[PDB]
Design an enzyme around this catalytic site. Structure first.
Site, PDB file in Angstrom:
ATOM      1  N   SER C 204       3.111   5.756   7.157  1.00 40.83           N
ATOM      2  CA  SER C 204       4.618   4.892   7.440  1.00 40.83           C
ATOM      3  C   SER C 204       4.853   3.996   6.276  1.00 40.83           C
ATOM      4  O   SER C 204       3.993   3.067   6.309  1.00 40.83           O
ATOM      5  CB  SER C 204       4.774   4.428   8.799  1.00 40.83           C
ATOM      6  OG  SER C 204       6.262   4.032   8.670  1.00 40.83           O
ATOM      7  N   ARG C 205       5.641   3.626   5.244  1.00 44.26           N
ATOM      8  CA  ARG C 205       5.624   3.136   4.435  1.00 44.26           C
ATOM      9  C   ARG C 205       6.709   1.750   5.052  1.00 44.26           C
ATOM     10  O   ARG C 205       6.514   0.833   4.662  1.00 44.26           O
ATOM     11  CB  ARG C 205       7.234   3.547   2.789  1.00 44.26           C
ATOM     12  CG  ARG C 205       5.885   4.444   1.867  1.00 44.26           C
ATOM     13  CD  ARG C 205       7.174   4.206   0.806  1.00 44.26           C
ATOM     14  NE  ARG C 205       6.341   6.161   0.093  1.00 44.26           N
ATOM     15  CZ  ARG C 205       6.479   7.026   0.536  1.00 44.26           C
ATOM     16  NH1 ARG C 205       7.122   7.621   1.366  1.00 44.26           N
ATOM     17  NH2 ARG C 205       6.010   8.005  -0.464  1.00 44.26           N
ATOM     18  N   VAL C 206       7.129   2.242   5.968  1.00 45.16           N
ATOM     19  CA  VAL C 206       7.992   1.179   6.643  1.00 45.16           C
ATOM     20  C   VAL C 206       6.774   0.676   7.545  1.00 45.16           C
ATOM     21  O   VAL C 206       6.858  -0.833   7.551  1.00 45.16           O
ATOM     22  CB  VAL C 206       8.660   1.601   7.774  1.00 45.16           C
ATOM     23  CG1 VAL C 206       9.389   0.460   8.937  1.00 45.16           C
ATOM     24  CG2 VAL C 206       9.664   2.448   7.362  1.00 45.16           C
TER      25      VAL C 206
END
Ligand SMILES: Nc1ncnc2c1ncn2[C@@H]1O[C@H](COP(=O)(O)OP(=O)(O)OP(=O)(O)O)[C@@H](O)[C@H]1O
Lengths: 119, 119, 340, 214, 59, 132, 116, 85
Positions: C204-206
């Site tokens: 997840s880039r978040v």
């Protein structure tokens, strides 16, 4: 494009400011740089540090161009660039932004690069 | 066998069997090498690799590529040569003496040269 | 992921967790769900609706049917239809989760529509703008401003890969769009790892910016242990020629893996998930046999639902880890490891 | 030559290289373990072999040949190389009976000479060899083979010259008959009334077997 | 006693001596090297001149 | 040499290897033999018993399971044996006696077992002198 | 499990995982042979091929192909049969005595038949 | 061929690799099948080869373990010998 007569016939080294870049893979003043690597590695931090190092070193400016940039991530980028001071909303922002978002037809995204180019 | 003679057919049959065996074992040779063979298989690979270098033949046309006179090798001598190789009468002779050679007498001559020179 | 790997079941139990807040009152913590069945069979959809009735998920469910009986432009328009439906909630300052399932059939339908409309095809006969399709879709999910009212639309699209391939054109496009993958594998499901998550690919880039802080302060080690363990776990098919470092790595990796196996229709609250991770990280399970872990867990839960329930409520309310929480947590942890 | 064939094959070979890497690491661990046993056998054996340097037990004038590999293979030019040293020494004396220790050298030698093989030892290469095992097999040689009757005894082992090199190596064993016949032997004080050569020959056999195995 | 006539070889005599010494171990101090040192697992098979077979017996 | 080079060697761990030593005390075939810094080159088979190694330091007390003591003619005495032993900790009476009764029972069996079990009874009763 | 019974579900699950571990170990044994495994690993390989050939089942339709009459094997026999095989009660019986066999009683019948 | 094998009543497959190994004709037993098979076979020929095909199949299956070059028992070695013959 500029003519063959207008080409500077010897590429000097663009002094960036970062030790490793100026040491190992030196950048041509007016050259092409292939940055690899996915997100989460401070790639945005790296490129903002590049912006400040050019602003202090050579005084030239930065034009960022997000072709097909994730609009949420473009927002987080813009908010960070406000917060890290390369964008000053009242004073001198040292950079111009062009964001061709992903939701734009391909006619946009095949021209966002040329827009940032002309700027 | 009713056209080229039975013996010619048998010799060519055994040659194709030997080389097919080598080509089958090629992948295990690529991974493990000749050490992880059975000794019958190892002898077969040795004889087949002798045969492969024995197949090559000096050309009068490509003499400018070799500096070597061409070899117009007769049929029956070739049959008896491959016969003696399939019989393994020259397994003592190393592989390099088979390379780029005329008849089996020329293999004897080249093995003599390698014995007198490499010593 | 590939087919028949509980992707639907993952998103389904993801919806089923929302009983914990939709039965409550805080709309800013509530979450309305829209499942979007596309190119499926009616029996599966009715089975799903009946299953939502079996947990009373139809209190907050919205179902959009784009079955294979229906026409191709219905299957084309149904994701945008549900997108407008979700944007209604999003512009109410609310929270909406949508699950597209799938997008591959939807891309096939749009391909059929464009090919029969004599538009020039591209790679694998797809149209050019199909990327422009999904990019126009998925950007409709967002998180709004406090100026706007901080609405939130969240999207869970489903990509049925073929042969476990990401180099195919539509999965490459969607991977280029999304904020990271939750990648599944068939082989792990045949090792009974349920859900069959390849942690080595799912990112997840978040990421950690929107994780529960109680879960965050113990979860960072877990990623490190698994990253260690995946490098080493090929050693497990040999003798005892490992040092106690790598054999300890095998112990931790197998036991944390056996933790992550769980059943379908088993939503676990975060107050429940935290002590399992705390015990698995901190070596308390290393002496416990590999088979008992899942029931150990269960008994462990009952133990904390017998004696330390106030600590669990404090975990749920604060979402962080006090030092007293860590102390009493390790106290109860070693206590139940001793009595198990 | 499909994408499917090349893909499945490439995945198979990636699995193969991963397994060979793990096998190399396990081989390094077992090699580091086995060097301790090799040194502790060698330093024990040197205390008896310095004696044979001093007590020059050099024999004069049927022969017993013992080869040493393991049950497993997968070590390259060892099982065939030591069998080739067996071939060298056995072409000299074809009457020389053979007792193999190791299944793989037994299969090397049984194909070429099933005649001379009269005892085979199995269950060896799983562990570093112990003196319990080596002394037990040396007892078996003077129980079913009676090697003291045999005039000349050769032990065939494998000498690691480096980690990247090796050598199939020969070690002679002198019977206790030779031990009293040794020229530099009355220099050493020995009791006539204690069977010291007839037990020290057994002790020599046990130590040289343990050294050859380790 | 009369192991030279009836029982063991002297190497095997000291082997039985070592088995008795390690058999008289402190069980705290009886490590895995001791038990593996007594892990008698070798199998002997007497062949013949026609390469016949005996029993692979536990030595 | 001043003193002596002791090579005390075992299959698992050669403890002393040319260690400079004043006196060794070892149960050999002729009984307990004490050897000082010099000696005749002499080969002796060693009975299982108590070896006392006296050095420039004090005298250590080990048990030995038999072996060979060989005086290399440079005054290097090589003890080549199997078992080392602590002061008395490795020796335990309940371990010895309960096995010794079973070994007296196995000494009533067939001569392959009986001779070996008689040896084991002898060794455990020599170890009773280590129990002392 | 709530449909086909918890025990039957677990039996099928263990069979599934056993065959998956077998298919996983197929890279080594094709290259480095059986010898490199552990004893539990070789036991799992054995039991997996046992279960594998125990799935073979003659067909009365295919009796013209096999010469073997078809077996209609019931559910509750099948559950207990795979239960006993997962418990390893018949590990002594070789894998060849499982080929084209109906129930576990027919397994015992073929195993006693192969005594000759 | 994917169209044609979908049509026919069986197939006969002829790897040239076997033809170079002297197998004339070079019939791949493991793939060449007859969808009808024994029902039109000669019955005297059926009685003497009632289990021959699956025997050669398991011969080639177990024979792959012998390609590793490990030791096998005389049952499997006997089947190896008989299938080789
Ligand atoms: N955690 C789990 N516990 C029990 N069963 C599971 C679990 N995860 C998946 N399964 C089983 O795996 C099977 C496949 O799941 P599912 O049908 O949801 O796949 P899918 O996501 O619908 O993919 P597709 O649309 O290709 O079928 C289901 O029958 C389900 O019971």
């Amino acid at each position: 494009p500029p003519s063959f007569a207008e080409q500077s016939t010897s590429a000097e080294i663009l002094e960036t400011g970062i030790k490793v870049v100026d040491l190992l893979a030196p950048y041509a003043r007016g050259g092409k740089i292939g940055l690899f690597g996915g997100a989460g590695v401070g790639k945005t931090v790296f490129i903002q540090e590049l912006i400040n190092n050019i602003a202090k070193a050579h005084g030239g400016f930065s034009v960022f161009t997000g072709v097909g940039e994730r609009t949420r991530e473009g927002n987080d980028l813009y908010r960070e660039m406000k917060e890290t001071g390369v964008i000053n909303l009242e004073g001198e922002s040292k950079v111009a932004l062009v964001f061709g978002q992903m939701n734009e037809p391909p006619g946009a995204r095949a021209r966002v690069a040329l827009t940032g180019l002309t700027i | 066998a009713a056209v080229v003679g039975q013996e010619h057919y048998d010799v060519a049959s055994k040659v194709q069997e030997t080389l097919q065996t080598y080509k089958s074992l090629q992948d295990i040779i690529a991974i493990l090498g000749m050490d992880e063979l059975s000794e019958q298989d190892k002898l077969t690979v040795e004889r087949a690799r002798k045969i492969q270098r024995f197949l090559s033949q000096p050309f009068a046309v490509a003499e400018v590529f070799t500096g070597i006179p061409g070899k117009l090798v007769r049929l029956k001598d070739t049959v008896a040569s491959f016969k003696a190789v399939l019989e393994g009468k020259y397994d003592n002779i190393p592989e390099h003496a088979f390379y780029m050679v005329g008849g089996i007498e020329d293999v004897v001559a080249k093995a003599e040269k390698l014995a007198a020179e490499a010593n | 992921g590939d087919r028949q790997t509980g992707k639907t079941a993952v998103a389904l139990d993801t919806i089923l967790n929302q009983k914990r807040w939709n039965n409550g009152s805080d709309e800013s913590k509530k979450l309305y769900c829209v499942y979007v069945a596309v190119g499926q069979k009616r029996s599966t959809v009715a089975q799903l609706v009946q299953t939502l009735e079996q947990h009373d998920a139809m209190k907050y469910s919205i179902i959009v049917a784009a079955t294979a009986s229906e026409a191709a432009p219905l299957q084309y328009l149904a994701p945008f239809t549900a997108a407008s439906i979700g944007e209604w909630f999003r512009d109410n300052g609310k929270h909406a989760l949508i699950v597209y399932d799938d997008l591959s059939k939807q891309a096939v339908a749009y391909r059929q529509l464009s090919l029969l409309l004599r538009r020039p095809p591209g790679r694998e006969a797809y149209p050019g703008d199909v990327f422009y399709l999904h990019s126009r879709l998925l950007e409709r999910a967002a998180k709004l401003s406090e100026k706007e009212g901080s609405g939130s639309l969240t999207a869970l699209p489903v990509i049925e890969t073929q042969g476990g391939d990401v180099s195919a054109y539509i999965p490459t496009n969607v991977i280029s769009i999304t904020d990271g993958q939750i990648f599944l594998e068939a082989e792990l499901f045949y090792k009974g790892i349920r859900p069959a998550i390849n942690v080595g690919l799912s990112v997840s880039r978040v990421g950690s910016a929107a994780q529960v802080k109680a879960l965050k302060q113990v979860a960072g080690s877990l990623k490190l242990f698994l990253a260690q363990y995946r490098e080493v776990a090929a050693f497990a098919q040999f003798g005892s020629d490992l040092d106690a470092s790598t054999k300890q790595t095998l112990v931790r990796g197998e036991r944390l893996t056996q933790l992550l196996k769980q059943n379908q229709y088993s939503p676990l609250a975060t107050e429940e998930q935290v002590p399992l991770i705390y015990a698995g990280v901190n070596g308390h399970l290393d002496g416990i046999e590999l088979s008992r872990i899942g029931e150990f867990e269960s008994s462990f839960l009952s133990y904390l639902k017998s004696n330390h329930n106030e600590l669990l409520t404090e975990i749920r309310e604060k979402g962080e880890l006090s030092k007293e929480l860590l102390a009493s947590l390790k106290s109860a942890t070693e206590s139940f490891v001793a009595t198990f | 030559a499909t994408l499917k064939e090349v893909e499945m094959r490439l995945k198979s070979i990636k699995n193969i290289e991963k397994i060979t890497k793990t096998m190399k690491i396990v081989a390094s661990t077992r090699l580091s373990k086995a060097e301790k046993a090799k040194i502790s056998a060698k330093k024990m054996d040197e205390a008896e072999q310095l004696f044979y340097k001093n007590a020059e037990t050099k024999n004069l004038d049927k022969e017993l040949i013992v080869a040493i590999t393991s049950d497993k293979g997968l070590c390259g030019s060892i099982h065939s190389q030591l069998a080739k040293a067996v071939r060298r020494h056995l072409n000299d004396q074809p009457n020389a009976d053979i007792v193999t220790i190791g299944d793989k050298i037994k299969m090397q030698l049984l194909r070429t000479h099933p005649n001379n093989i009269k005892l085979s030892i199995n269950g060896i290469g799983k562990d570093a060899p112990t003196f319990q095992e080596s002394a037990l097999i040396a007892d078996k040689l003077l129980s079913v083979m009676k090697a003291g009757t045999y005039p000349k005894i050769s032990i065939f082992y494998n000498d690691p010259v480096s980690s990247l090199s090796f050598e199939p190596s020969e070690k002679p064993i002198f019977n206790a008959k030779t031990i009293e016949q040794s020229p530099s032997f009355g220099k050493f004080e020995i009791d006539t009334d204690a069977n010291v050569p007839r037990d020290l020959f057994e002790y020599t056999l046990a130590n040289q077997m343990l050294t050859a195995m380790a | 006693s009369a192991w030279r006539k009836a029982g063991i070889s002297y190497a095997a005599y000291l082997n039985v001596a070592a088995q008795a010494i390690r058999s008289s171990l402190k069980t705290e101090l009886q490590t895995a090297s001791v038990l593996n040192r007594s892990q008698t697992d070798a199998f002997y098979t007497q062949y013949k001149n026609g390469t016949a077979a005996s029993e692979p017996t536990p030595i | 040499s001043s003193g002596l080079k002791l090579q005390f060697a075992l299959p698992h761990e050669t403890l002393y290897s040319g260690s400079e030593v004043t006196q060794v005390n070892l149960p050999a075939k002729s009984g307990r033999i004490g050897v000082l810094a010099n000696h005749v080159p002499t080969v002796e088979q060693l009975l299982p018993g108590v070896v006392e190694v006296m050095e420039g330091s004090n005298s250590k007390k080990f048990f030995i399971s038999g072996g060979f003591a060989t005086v290399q003619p440079d005054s290097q005495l090589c003890v080549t044996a199997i078992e080392a032993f602590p002061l008395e900790s490795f020796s335990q009476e309940n371990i010895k006696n309960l096995l010794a009764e079973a070994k007296k029972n196995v000494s009533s069996s067939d001569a392959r077992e009986a001779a070996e079990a008689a040896i084991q009874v002898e060794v455990l009763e020599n170890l009773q002198s280590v129990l002392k």
